[PDB]
Amino acid sequence: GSHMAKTVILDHDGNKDDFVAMILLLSNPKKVNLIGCICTDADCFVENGFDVTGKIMCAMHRLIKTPLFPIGKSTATAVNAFPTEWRFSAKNLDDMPFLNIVEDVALWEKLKPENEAHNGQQLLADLVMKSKEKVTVCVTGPLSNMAWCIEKYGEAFTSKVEECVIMGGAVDVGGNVFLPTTDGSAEWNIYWDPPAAKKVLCCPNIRCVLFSLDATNTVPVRSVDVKGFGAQNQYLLSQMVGTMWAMSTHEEILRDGDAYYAWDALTAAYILEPTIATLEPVALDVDVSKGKSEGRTPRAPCVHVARNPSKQMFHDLVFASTRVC
Amino acid sequence: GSHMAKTVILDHDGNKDDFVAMILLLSNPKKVNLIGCICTDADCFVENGFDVTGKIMCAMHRLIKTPLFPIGKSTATAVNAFPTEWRFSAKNLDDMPFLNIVEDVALWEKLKPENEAHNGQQLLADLVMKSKEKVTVCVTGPLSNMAWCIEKYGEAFTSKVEECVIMGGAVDVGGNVFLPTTDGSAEWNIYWDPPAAKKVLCCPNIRCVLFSLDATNTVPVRSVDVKGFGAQNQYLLSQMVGTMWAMSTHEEILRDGDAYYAWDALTAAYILEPTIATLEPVALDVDVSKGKSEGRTPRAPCVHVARNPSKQMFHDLVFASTRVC
Ligand SMILES: Nc1ncnc2c(CN3C[C@H](O)[C@H](O)[C@H]3CO)c[nH]c12
Ligand SMILES: Nc1ncnc2c(CN3C[C@H](O)[C@H](O)[C@H]3CO)c[nH]c12
Ligand SMILES: [Ca+2]
Ligand SMILES: [Ca+2]
Ligand code: NI
Ligand code: NI
Ligand code: NI
Ligand code: NI
Ligand code: NI
Ligand code: NI
Ligand code: NI
Ligand code: NI
């Protein structure tokens, strides 16, 4: 009546934040049975994102005996690609000492061929449709994989989704896509593939919970907090998350307040702690045009938008989860 | 006859590479008695560079009982400042879990006020002039501090310098300063303050050993090597160096071969292992103009230029040093 874990798939795109989200999900087996991961070539180079996902899976299997699970590289392609500099973070992570423990590298190398054979879109569809229980899909990259599954399988897929908890969009606040060809109103995950986001967010047959910039703006990644991992450096997961966050704490200074945030991590935290935010039903009209507002998610119900997230609950959950091992 | 350590001061500017160099020096007390560090506001923000230097000093004191030493922030100012993005690396390091162990942070906080009172230029002068033995100065940032000391104190300073081992310049190869106003012939440490470099490099009263891009081009920082730290992740110094290097392994891809190198680390390695490279006496003519070649170090003896460094010896020294603790 509270003692059974939710079945979850993480559909991510391999930035630092994506991996913090993976760690939060995977480190909490009482609450989450992570049955698969999809990695998309969006805010990473997919081979690096794939390898980091595999090595984290292997490390956690070793330390706390969470099951192994299938991992698939999506073949989704960008409409509007991420900045190249951002996409390298998974390469840096692949090279970190905490991600190169000999035993973990060896297990991943053993498991890699079976996973390499997966198509990520097909794997998402298969895991959802074959699962005994309805599945929560946590989407922390673009919506391309969910769109593909909806288009191919319709009800046979949507009927098996418990809910889809998505990082994307910006409803009543500005976006984060600042390019010569954009007006600053759009958020990157939507902007990468706007038609896919339009197809999913207003699909009347799935419950979507949307962590847009409205909510994620509450959780900038800041030195004062990140330094807290030092007290827990004996835990591998604290080495991991602390390093992932420490790589990003300068961005708020660099960009004059436009921080690196715990975007995906907060999204995953909702699955672990549904009282972490309040939900507001909202109808959205996703901009799929080629004009300056491409990818905007203005108000036109399509989704349940997260509001007023608890910074304290988030903090506590991250620090506790990173003491698991 | 081989059992006595060299007295060394590190005059650095706080990029990742600078800290690897510090670690190599400090982790080898049989060979090096590190009696002080200077930090310059060049390839870092000096407060972050100061704090990282202090915390590394404190961690090594805790683990292997190397002495504490004075640290001073230079007040030298840029002629041509570093790219802002590069300068943030010391902030990221300050926030890393391996640099936030409670005991280390506490000791540094205790020692910080006495160090804050130092002027870095004056401290360099004082440590050299008061040392019982002649001092090797390892210069891994710009030459501003050495220039200041030479100008103020002349022979009383230069006579107490054993040798000055400097990372800078590019003699028979291209530079690394690529800006709209430059021709690509200059190296950054020289370019930051060309008049200071002119004053030191051709000072006839000090032995200068120069690790220019000619030599440092042998040691790009690459994933295949950096992943080797995983096998030694139980060692704090391997967590440190492995992370410092893992933060940089994408740059060779990003810049189409123009890698992040072990520039300063190789420079420090020469102090530990003087047979690591061969020396060629060369007269240089440092360009102090405001034209496109500003900061170039073309051939006009001023210095002993390092040639044909041993990649294998370097590798072995770094991996061994990072198993010290
Ligand atoms: N400064 C930044 N660095 C890297 N990625 C991003 C992104 C794109 N991503 C990063 C998170 O994983 C999240 O899923 C999404 C936020 O727009 C926006 N700003 C970024
Ligand atoms: N890609 C890069 N990132 C950061 N700093 C640099 C520099 C400046 N520094 C970095 C090393 O500490 C070295 O002392 C010097 C090399 O020009 C050149 N290229 C850089
Ligand atoms: Ca993401
Ligand atoms: Ca340097
Ligand atoms: Ni129960
Ligand atoms: Ni097993
Ligand atoms: Ni399979
Ligand atoms: Ni706290
Ligand atoms: Ni001896
Ligand atoms: Ni002591
Ligand atoms: Ni003093
Ligand atoms: Ni090796």
Q: What is the per-residue DSSP string for A117-168?
A: T-BHHHHHHHHHHH-SS-EEEEE-S-SHHHHHHHHHHTHHHHTTEEEEEEE-
Element (H, E) at B149: helix B144-153
**Phi-psi domain of A2 (left: phi exceeds 0; alpha: psi -120 through 50; beta: other):** left
Q: What is the CATH number of domain B1-325?
A: 3.90.245.10
CB A194 within 8 A of CB A237: no
Encoded tokens for A233: 């450096």
Alpha-carbon distance B128 to A290, whole Å?
64
User: In Å, how far from its chain's centre is CA B23?
Assistant: 11
Pairwise CB contact (< 8 Å): B254 & A88: yes
**How many Cβ contacts (< 8 angstroms) between chains A and B?**
111
Domain boundaries of chain A, sorted by first residue: 1-325
Which ligand 2 atom sits closest to the C-alpha of B18? 12
CA-based end-to-end distance of chain A: 27
Alpha-carbon distance A35 to A128, whole Å?
10
Alpha-carbon distance B269 to B24, whole Å?
7
Encoded tokens for A290: 């080629």
Element (H, E) at A211: strand A208-211
* C-alpha count within 13 angstroms, C-beta hemisphere, residue A193: 21
Q: Which of A7, A3, A9 is nearest to A22 (CA)?
A: A9
Measured in Å, residue A64 CA sits from the centre of ligand 2 at 41
Coil, strand, or helix at residue B178? coil
Measured in Å, residue B238 CA sits from the centre of ligand 12 at 13
CB of residue B51 inside a 6 A radius of ligand 2: no
Q: Sign of the C-alpha dihedral, residues B248, B249, B250, B252?
A: positive
Which residues lie below 8 Å from residue A182, measured CB to CB, with a gap of 6+? Answer: A175, A191, A292, A293, A294, A295
CB A169 within 8 A of CB A191: no
Encoded tokens for A196: 């896919």
Identify residue B61 by its one-letter amino acid code. Answer: H
CB A61 within 8 A of CB A67: yes
User: Rounded to 5 degrees, what angle do the CA atoms A252, A169, A13 make?
Assistant: 75
Alpha-carbon distance B95 to A241, whole Å?
12
Which residues lie below 8 Å from residue B136, measured CB to CB, with a gap of 6+? Answer: B6, B7, B8, B9, B161, B162, B163, B164, B165, B271
Q: Which of A160, A165, A172 is nearest to A200 (CA)?
A: A165
Alpha-carbon distance A287 to A61, whole Å?
42
The dihedral over CA atoms of B310, B311, B316, B322, expressed in degrees to the nearest 10, equals: 120
Encoded tokens for B247: 């933060």
CB B30 within 8 A of CB B321: no
Alpha-carbon distance B325 to B237, whole Å?
6
CB of residue A193 inside a 6 A radius of ligand 1: no
Encoded tokens for B110: 């205790």
Q: Whose CA is nearest to atom 3 of ligand 2?
A: B86
Alpha-carbon distance B229 to B325, whole Å?
13
Pairwise CB contact (< 8 Å): B92 & A247: yes
Q: Whose CA is nearest to atom 17 of ligand 1?
A: A188
Which residues of A have a catalytic role annotated? 13, 18, 43, 86, 140, 189, 263-264
Nearest CB partner across the interface for B230, out of A97, A231, A249: A97
Q: Structure resolution in Å?
A: 1.3
Q: Whose CA is nearest to atom 2 of ligand 1?
A: A260
Alpha-carbon distance B176 to B43, whole Å?
14
Strand partners of residue A73: A39, A119
Identify residue A256 by its one-letter amino acid code. Answer: D
DSSP letter for each residue of B53-107: HHHHHHHHHHHH-PPP--EEE-----SSPPPHHHHTHHHHHHTSGGG--HHHHHH
CB A95 within 8 A of CB A55: no
User: Rounded to 5 degrees, what angle do the CA atoms A134, A139, A141 make?
Assistant: 160
Cα–Cα separations (whole angstroms), residue B245 to A94, B27, B37:
12, 17, 21
Coil, strand, or helix at residue B12? strand
CB of residue B264 inside a 6 A radius of ligand 2: yes
Q: Which of B163, B168, B147 is nearest to B74 (CA)?
A: B147
User: Rounded to 5 degrees, what angle do the CA atoms B236, B252, B303 make?
Assistant: 80
CB of residue B11 inside a 6 A radius of ligand 2: no
Alpha-carbon distance A272 to A267, whole Å?
9
Alpha-carbon distance A225 to A315, whole Å?
9
Burial class of A31 by CB neighbour count within 10 A (0 to 12, 13 to 18, 19+): middle
The experimental method, as deposited, was: X-ray
Report every protein residue that has its C-beta within 5 angstroms of ion ligand 11. B 70
Active site residue B43: yes
User: In Å, how far from its chain's centre is CA A71?
Assistant: 14
Strand partners of residue A287: none
Q: Could you tell me the strand order of the sheet in which B71-73 lies?
A: B71-73, B32-39, B6-12, B135-139, B161-167, B208-211, B303-307, B278-282
Residue of B45, B250, B252, B256 best to disrupt the A interface, most CBs of A under 10 A:
B250
DSSP letter for each residue of A94-118: HTSGGG--HHHHHHHHHHHHHHHT-
Q: Which positions in chain B touch A83 (Cβ < 8 Å)? A: none
Could you say which ligand is closest to the alpha carbon of residue A86? 1
What are the φ/ψ torsions at residue B14 (nearest 5 degrees)? 70, 20
Element (H, E) at A257: none
CB A240 within 8 A of CB A98: yes
What are the φ/ψ torsions at residue A139 (nearest 5 degrees)? -110, 110
Alpha helices in chain A (DSSP H): 16-26, 46-64, 84-87, 89-94, 102-116, 120-130, 144-153, 155-158, 188-192, 194-201, 213-216, 223-226, 236-246, 251-254, 263-272, 311-321
Q: Which of B260, B279, B320 is nearest to B85 (CA)?
A: B260
Active site residue B189: yes
Q: Which residue carries 């006839």 as its tokens? A: B204
Cα–Cα separations (whole angstroms), residue A66 to A26, A34, A260, A324, A325:
7, 9, 29, 12, 12
